[PDB]
Amino acid sequence: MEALVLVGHGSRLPYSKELLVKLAEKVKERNLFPIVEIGLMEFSEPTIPQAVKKAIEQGAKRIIVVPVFLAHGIHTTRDIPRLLGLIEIPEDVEIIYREPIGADDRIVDIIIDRAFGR
Amino acid sequence: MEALVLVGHGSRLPYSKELLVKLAEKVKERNLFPIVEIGLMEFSEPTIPQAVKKAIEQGAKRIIVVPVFLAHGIHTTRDIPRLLGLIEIPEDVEIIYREPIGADDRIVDIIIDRAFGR
Ligand SMILES: [Co+2]
Ligand SMILES: [Co+2]
């Protein structure tokens, strides 16, 4: 009844989409969610609406959208809330737009390990 | 003798720069590095060359540049290695260009907490 939609920027390069896909897989391996889909905002497929529709077609009534972005930007405050009709497609269900990653202590952990070539 | 330079995108919005600054502070609190500076690519200050110079002026001979980005993109593969003269300013100092964040298991942790409004 719950779906998690991971949402990302998307580049013309494939790294960004690879990143989303690997992330989705790892959350699948954690078995917390019935439905788990990804969506990219620009120049990639599947797109955010495609992902939301795909979640709904699988019968999800609460769609948790997580913006996989470090910080808030135009994308997280305008475009995505727009694409989800949260501002200014979906019937019956409620979309739950979550927060970005932000300056989480676990990121400073990752940054340090990254600094040391680890 | 070692400096850590955190490097980020930068938007016209201030969230991105806030993010870098908070991160730099937290790594300062961890007391692992003599010198710790931030630099943004565009739209904001300090810029990446400014940050590198600032590290050098403080007497660092090994500059560890960490790209605070989820994935590789044009920025991490072209522009930043360019700005650091690593491809097509420094004296007798070696710049060490580290990896981005990538699909780290700690990010899937962050994503889950983020999904639950935590
Ligand atoms: Co964008
Ligand atoms: Co950019």
UniProtKB/Swiss-Prot annotation, chains A, B:
Signal peptide start and end residues: none
E.C. numbers: 4.99.1.3, 4.99.1.11
Keyword Lyase: yes
Transit peptide recorded as keyword: no
Active site feature: 9 (proton acceptor)
GO MF terms held by the record: cobalt ion binding; nickel cation binding; sirohydrochlorin cobaltochelatase activity
Keywords, sorted A to Z: Cobalamin biosynthesis, Cobalt, Lyase, Metal-binding, Methanogenesis, Nickel
Known pathway: Cofactor biosynthesis; adenosylcobalamin biosynthesis; cob(II)yrinate a,c-diamide from sirohydrochlorin (anaerobic route): step 1/10
UniProt record similarity statement: Belongs to the CbiX family. CbiXS subfamily.
Name of the molecule in the record: Sirohydrochlorin cobaltochelatase
Organism lineage string: Archaea, Methanobacteriati, Methanobacteriota, Methanomada group, Methanococci
